[PDB]
Design a protein around this ligand. Structure first.
Ligand SMILES: Cc1sc2c(c1C)C(c1ccc(Cl)cc1)=N[C@@H](CC(=O)NCCCCNC(=O)COc1cccc3c1C(=O)N([C@H]1CCC(=O)NC1=O)C3=O)c1nnc(C)n1-2
Length: 127
């Protein structure tokens, strides 16, 4: 079995910015979620080989995880905050699609998403 390559984190042709909103997404949002007791499954791509999930990447065709998001934020991959918010949303939705309601990992993702949304409510106005 094999894992796919990870999502892109470097592309010199993609235009970049570091807006106050993107700074907040790293400093506050990512860093707060990262330290949560339920962060660990989401801190790196799903290793479908290690976890014996041969169907994972047959079902999940837009993989995303907080390790990738952290790299994208630290390496300024984004132009805007919405791109990053979309990555978080993709991560949560993937978990809900692959797993069943009430599964432990779904409860973990839901707790992180609740926290994420709280933090997004204080996203600063773009200066
Ligand atoms: C590092 C990561 S990343 C990650 C995860 C981890 C550990 C986790 C995860 C999970 C829990 C927590 Cl608290 C935290 C993280 N989750 C995975 C999903 C997962 O592992 N999904 C696995 C789901 C497996 C369930 N499926 C079965 O057990 C299928 O088994 C069946 C189903 C039907 C019939 C039979 C059998 C079976 O084994 N047998 C055997 C029995 C023995 C026998 O004699 N004969 C048989 O045929 C059946 O008859 C996941 N999804 N998103 C993320 C993120 N993750």
């Amino acid at each position: 079995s094999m894992n796919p390559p990870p999502p892109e984190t470097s592309n010199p042709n993609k235009p970049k910015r570091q807006t106050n909103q993107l700074q907040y997404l790293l400093r506050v949002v990512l860093k707060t979620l990262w330290k949560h007791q339920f962060a660990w499954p989401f801190q790196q791509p799903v290793d479908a080989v290690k976890l014996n999930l041969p169907d994972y990447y047959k079902i999940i065709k837009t993989p995303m995880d907080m390790g990738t998001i952290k790299k994208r934020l630290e390496n300024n991959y984004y132009w805007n905050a919405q791109e990053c918010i979309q990555d978080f949303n993709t991560m949560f939705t993937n978990c809900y699609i692959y797993n069943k309601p009430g599964d432990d990992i779904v409860l973990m993702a839901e707790a992180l998403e609740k926290l994420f949304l709280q933090k997004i409510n204080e996203l600063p106005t773009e200066e």
